[PDB]
Amino acid sequence: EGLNLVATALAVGLGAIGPGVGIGIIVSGAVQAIGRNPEIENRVVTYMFIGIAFTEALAIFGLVIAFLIGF
């Protein structure tokens, strides 16, 4: 039946909320730090884009398995 479709739904929806709030927390902390001190932007930027990527990786898994259900 549609259990594969349910699996795709669970994979795309659940597993995206985690990174969905993680991106926001990361960028908000970075923005607050950069506002309190703009003379350390570069380093901040680095610590931005790694962290995003890491939690983006958490999203990526929750994406790819869904495609693996699609086959």
Partner: protein
């Protein structure tokens, strides 16, 4: 007190649908959306020619209203970026004015009630609503979203060298792992815009229709106010997002 007492007008009416094509007897058939779009274009042209027919110092009346509206938009866009505030002004300004009157047109009496058919609902006719909000259709909204995306890409490529495709598909290390989806997000920026504008007007008009079915009078007035508010917010915000995306692209 202020009781409703509108059981006669409380008949079952929960009909909702996507864009409805008009008679289109001749070639290239038209829809109910693309007569409302035409009438909003006519209204905008009439307002512009009323503001343009008498231009002088110390603006007053309609001319002052047009100047204040245009100058507020100019200030808002300058606050984001001042370099392209004149190079991209006509597009964003046209986007705001066209959508806002289209959104407000769906609140006029007759929207969803005037049935083109072939109102005419006691019979077996389709009773297609003549007045359908242009922004509540996935054709006009998709067209404006895609033309905004084209404008962003062209001007994002007009002065960037071959460096526009440098934030994406790069070999800078971790920037690669974020460079692809950043482009992918850039791919979905128009779509996310269109589904944003198309749904909001559609959601509001369906809310008003449903509230009419629930209690015809004195119930949906706060929702009418909220919708006449959110329509102007959406019309302004589409242009604001277009300008912000252009600014982030040129930078």
């Amino acid at each position: 007190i202020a009781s409703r007492f509108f059981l006669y007008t409380g008949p079952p009416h929960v009909e909702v649908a996507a864009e409805v094509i008009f008679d289109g007897i001749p070639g290239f058939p038209i829809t109910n959306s693309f007569v409302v779009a035409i009438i909003i274009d006519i209204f905008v042209i009439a307002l512009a020619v009323a503001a343009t027919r008498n231009l002088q110092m110390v603006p007053r009346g309609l001319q002052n209203v047009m100047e204040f509206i245009l100058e507020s938009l100019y200030n808002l866009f300058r606050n984001i970026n001042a370099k392209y505030v004149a190079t991209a002004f006509p597009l964003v300004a046209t986007i705001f004015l066209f959508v806002l009157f289209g959104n407000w047109f769906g609140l006029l009496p007759g929207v969803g009630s005037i049935g083109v058919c072939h109102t005419c609902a006691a019979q077996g006719k389709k009773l297609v609503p003549l007045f359908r909000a242009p922004a509540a259709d996935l054709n006009f909204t998709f067209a404006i979203a895609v033309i905004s995306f084209v404008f962003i890409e062209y001007w994002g490529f007009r002065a960037l060298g071959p460096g526009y495709l440098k934030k994406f598909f790069n070999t800078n290390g971790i920037m690669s792992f974020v460079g692809i989806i950043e482009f992918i997000s850039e791919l979905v920026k128009p779509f996310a815009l269109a589904f944003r504008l198309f749904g909001n007007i559609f959601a509001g008009e369906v809310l008003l229709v449903v509230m009419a079915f629930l209690v015809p009078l004195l119930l949906p007035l706060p929702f009418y106010g909220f919708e006449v508010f959110v329509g102007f917010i959406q019309a302004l915000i589409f242009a604001l997002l277009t300008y912000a995306f252009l600014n982030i692209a040129v930078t």
